[PDB]
Symmetry: D2
Subunit: 326 residues, 4 copies
């Protein structure tokens, strides 16, 4: 049986409400010991040890927790055969991509959450955690980058995102599909992510205590330029635009971000639309303004890569190449 370390961070998986049949709940009621102990079948497949790293709702996820988790996994890689990280669902897709770029352990790292609190009827958390440990225990999971395991599916940390606010089946890799499906404790992998991850990235957060400041602005009809200007005035290192359609900008947001890019703020165009690439060579001349096109990276993912790009470089053409490789 492999040794598997559970790093716990809180979330609805550890969360609880006063009723099995009412939606109300709060995160962080159940600690890692009782989480693990609630799935005695874990003992059939692995030697499991739990550590509680933080205890937050993933809506409060932040750069300090990201830095703690990357350093812990990198430090502890040699002590275990694989990692499972229990986490809220809300920003699991962000943390998974951060780890995918910063973890230097090529052993399996698997994230897992729950869409129903531990107290609800038909709670999804137990079986999700079981299948997370199945995945982290599988030799075939190594070298695929950081994974999310939800609803019997293995998803790569770059493409994985939420599709639905409440559905237990919400996590999908919406552009390039899942890597494998889990049936009776076994995985048929048919895919692996081409984009560089983990030990083939240059990103090394081992000595960083803070990350570059990157904010996200939304585009819509009659959008205000005032949020964009407030990030510029606060000296943010970068701004990601959640653009309309193929990464387009309301005219005043365009005007503000064009000036910011010219005066040294890194600007990435992404899209509020949930699938497909924000492309070069459409309506916006990125080369002219020094903007970066996000590709399939959604605004929150693009933020992750932009912050790490900014630990390497501030040059727009070098950031674009990062966006083409990771």
């Amino acid at each position: 049986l492999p040794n598997i370390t559970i790093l716990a961070t809180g979330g609805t998986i550890a969360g609880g409400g006063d009723s099995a049949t009412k939606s109300n709940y709060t995160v962080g009621k159940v600690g890692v010991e009782n989480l693990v102990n609630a799935v005695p079948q874990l003992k059939d497949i692995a030697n499991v040890k739990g550590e509680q790293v933080v205890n937050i709702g993933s809506q409060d996820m932040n750069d300090n927790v990201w830095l703690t988790l990357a350093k812990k996994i990198n430090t502890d890689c040699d002590k275990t055969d694989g990692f499972v990280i229990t986490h809220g669902t809300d920003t699991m897709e962000e943390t998974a991509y951060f780890l995918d770029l910063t973890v230097k352990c090529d052993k399996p790292v698997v994230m897992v959450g729950a869409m129903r609190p531990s107290t609800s009827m038909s709670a999804d958390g137990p079986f999700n955690l079981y299948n997370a440990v199945v995945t982290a225990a599988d030799k075939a999971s190594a070298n695929r980058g950081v994974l999310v395991v939800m609803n019997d599916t293995v998803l790569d940390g770059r493409d994985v995102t939420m599709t639905n606010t409440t559905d237990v089946a919400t996590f999908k890799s919406v552009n390039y599909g899942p890597l494998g499906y889990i049936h009776n404790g076994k995985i048929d992998y048919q895919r692996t992510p081409a984009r560089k991850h983990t030990s083939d990235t240059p990103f090394d957060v081992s000595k960083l205590n803070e990350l570059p400041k990157v904010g996200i602005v939304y585009n819509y009809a009659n959008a205000s330029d005032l949020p964009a200007k407030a990030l510029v005035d606060a000296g943010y290192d970068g701004i990601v635009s959640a653009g309309v359609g193929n990464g387009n900008l309301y005219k005043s947001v365009f005007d503000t971000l064009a000036t910011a890019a010219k005066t040294g703020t890194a600007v990435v165009r992404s899209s509020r639309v949930p699938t497909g690439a924000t492309t070069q060579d459409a309506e916006v001349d990125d080369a002219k303004y020094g903007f970066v096109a996000s590709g399939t990276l959604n605004p929150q993912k693009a933020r992750v890569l932009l912050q790490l790009a900014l630990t390497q470089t501030k040059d727009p053409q070098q950031i674009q190449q990062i966006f083409n490789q990771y």
Copy 2:
């Protein structure tokens, strides 16, 4: 043959590249007259008249164009048998919901656009425009609210949204499904929206020359409170949160919007997750904070409703009742 009026606003359906073969283009350059004359088969199904309202990329759509359009459709309704509005795709979902709430005609109002430029190989605009007029001509289209017609499908203006940055099939009613499919110039309607629309709403912009100011703030890990503070400093009437998961807020954002709501700014919780309701009774006590839950309205749709709610009331309890009925 019915009398159908085409009100043009711009978009890629009216926009051009120097090559069939390359993705690059500019929008809103061709007039309604060149657009209609490019599709002579319209004459087989309707007596078409065309009027230019504006000629813009919908990434630049604004409240002034919305008011113009609503007032014109309302004034001209009695003298035509239905309307088609040619529009950019990027914000077509926002304008459709705006007209869905403010058009007092029960006659068909159909929006249409194109995902490919008019000069590209396999341009989608012609057949989209053809099918828009078929829909606007069908007696069964009346009393269904404002419609979008794209990719042989009839979509209700409330639920319609983009799923993909570039796919010709991007427009979907992602929560409740389409109303009908178009085949051979005929529609088989099997659905109608239950939410109150058009003549059944209290919203009347006939005498309004401005709308209440509503902005949208994104949530993500480590979110800045500066966008939210910039809207409050500008005296915004309302703020829509694009929450994580089921409408949840990063702690800093939550603090700022909780503040704003105490001074009487309306705060609507929506979600960046592209399907599913932002619900009551989850992790946020909306009653305590004076917040409204958006239900299945995404952030840009929720802005439309909130702006119009704020013409009627500033009371969050009445705003929540509006978000339950429309």
Copy 3:
């Protein structure tokens, strides 16, 4: 609280596992049959429809517990043959009752929520799975194992369930329950209707075997927009002229099998299934055959139900 009758038929979903049912309904159970729904059959459909029609005034609503594999066929059969306009809700489970995170308990709870909701009446027979209220006509499986398999893949769900409340935003336009002429009250068998599959180099032997057995109707699981392999097309075109009702459906999981594409249905005496997939199209063709053998009237039935 309303009185809710659970009619059990078997399935992986196989009260006390869900004590919280008593908070929302006065629940009573009856075993009708006890079978995997892979073995579901016309005898069970007739028992269920009669039982619901007979017992309608004894209860405030019905939940049918059923295997997932053919729940979509039983839901449509009942959608066209029950005359009780109280809520009728089918439910199943994609995971064993004994498994980790078994879905059957909350699926049953949410089915009883739906059958207890006054707003569920007059919507036709429903399937409730994965917090979603789906109409019996368009509901189908999308995935072989996913708890979220059931979707109304062409026209979408009627409403979503949150915290034991439903916000209905849709209702099926096609005629159902008391607005159909299908009456099975006196029938003890249904017209014989088989399905044949089309693929590259498809055999005509299946189609010829249903024809030799004197089947009343044949549904074709066509390729693309209801097309037929030449061997199959010739056997069915011969059958259609000689009395056999023939419906063109599609093996493609979403979209209508249309008129006015490649196949002149009028000339051949064929019926186009619309959005009805092969197994759904079998349900409507059996029931159509209880009323008529005329292909034009069958086509009109396929336009209205």
Copy 4:
């Protein structure tokens, strides 16, 4: 010295389909296939000249509803024989069975240059016909050096799909073709492809299937499952001495009792039996309700019934042993 951009030679092997189909009117749905020759298809897309030196060869001119084993063998042999004459292949084909041809060629093509299938969901006569840009993007894909070593492809609606997972999702949508279980390989924008995936299952020159000397294939039929299902389709194929039968099962590949009984007999008297699913996505698994090993059945995995037929036919050119056929279903 400076380099020149030299364009590749691309062969279009035309088989017919809606891409070469036509009706009376741009705004009526009615159409017939078999009208347009490949010469007229290439004349209709002069922009191909910008990206390849194209040659067109007509192999057959049929609707793909009438695709058959003879045409599959013609295509695999033609590609394998002509591999050294060109830099890549595009095959124009009907949509209705494209997913079957693509998977047959995915297992039988030994040429490791790109092989790209394409069709259209609207006839060439429709307003906003999809065929011209689809063909253009198919030749982009066939010309891209990165397309090699990814197996046989299907290019539709700006997407590059693997021939194993690609299937139709909708009867009429121009967007119908999706790799429903494992996703596409790449998207095409402005004539460039960003590939982020490649199929893990063995294909092309990594398979042992070799059709070079074959003039027919093992006979494999498909029976559907549903409530009250007749055993007569299954009995008819056993009685004709079929090599194999694919079941389109309900749910996770389950069998109506009468079909189960016939297939259990067939498997015992030298008919191969593969359990597939009429459900459009997900595996037909081992270890669920059917004891395959007990009955000598094979589980199809994510292969739908028509795709399962293609591999079972090829499997039967090698072995009749259900355990060896199960290994083939686990590796290709």
